[PDB]
Amino acid sequence: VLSEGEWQLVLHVWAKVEADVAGHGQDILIRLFKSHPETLEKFDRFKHLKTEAEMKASEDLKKHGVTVLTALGAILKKKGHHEAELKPLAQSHATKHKIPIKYLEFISEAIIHVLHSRHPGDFGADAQGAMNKALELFRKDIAAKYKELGYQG
Ligand code: HEM
Numbered sequence: 830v831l832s833e834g835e836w837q838l839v840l841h842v843w844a845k846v847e848a849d850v851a852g853h854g855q856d857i858l859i860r861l862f863k864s865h866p867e868t869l870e871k872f873d874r875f876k877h878l879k880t881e882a883e884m885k886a887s888e889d890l891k892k893h894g895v896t897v898l899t900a901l902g903a904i905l906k907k908k909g910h911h912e913a914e915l916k917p918l919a920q921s922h923a924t925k926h927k928i929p930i931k932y933l934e935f936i937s938e939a940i941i942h943v944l945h946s947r948h949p950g951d952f953g954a955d956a957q958g959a960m961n962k963a964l965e966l967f968r969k970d971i972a973a974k975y976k977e978l979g980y981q982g
């Protein structure tokens with residue numbers, strides 16, 4: 830749906846996030862985990878995790894932010910013609926993971942806070958919205974598939 834220009838904005842921020850992937854993932858992760866305790870409850874490999882200290886301390890977390898950020902970018906860069914990557918994920922998330930669209934949204938949040946937090950100058954409003962647009966988009970499709978599938982309350 831989103832504009833030539835908007836993709837523009839959405840993309841350059843990416844390239845920046847690409848500078849320190851693991852950092853960001855860790856970031857987003859922690860944000861998410863702190864803000865929506867429910868979300869972490871769902872990762873078996875992480876539940877053990879008690880403090881912010883612990884989190885940033887743990888390497889498997891690290892790796893984890895990585896796994897995610899990667900899939901994420903892959904989609905962005907596709908400027909909406911992201912089907913290739915999304916499908917599998919929607920299935921994965923709906924069928925084993927058990928992740929609520931609410932999470933996608935949740936996560937989505939930490940994402941932009943994180944982005945904001947880490948790029949004061951680079952990310953004013955023009956960027957912020959593009960970014961948000963992009964996200965609901967990811968949100969939209971993954972939602973659809975869910976339906977198809979019988980998920981999505
Ligand atoms: C930004 C959106 C996200 C992306 C791109 C994403 C991507 C991925 C990828 C690529 C995998 C591993 C291969 C696979 O299972 O598909 C994965 C595994 C998983 N993800 Fe997601 N994820 C996202 C958000 C979330 C959220 C919000 C939760 C929890 C609410 C979550 C929980 C999990 C769990 C539990 C696993 C298996 C975790 C593990 O490997 O043990 N993901 N995710």
Ligand SMILES: [O-]
Pocket residue numbers: 897
């Ligand atoms: O994830």
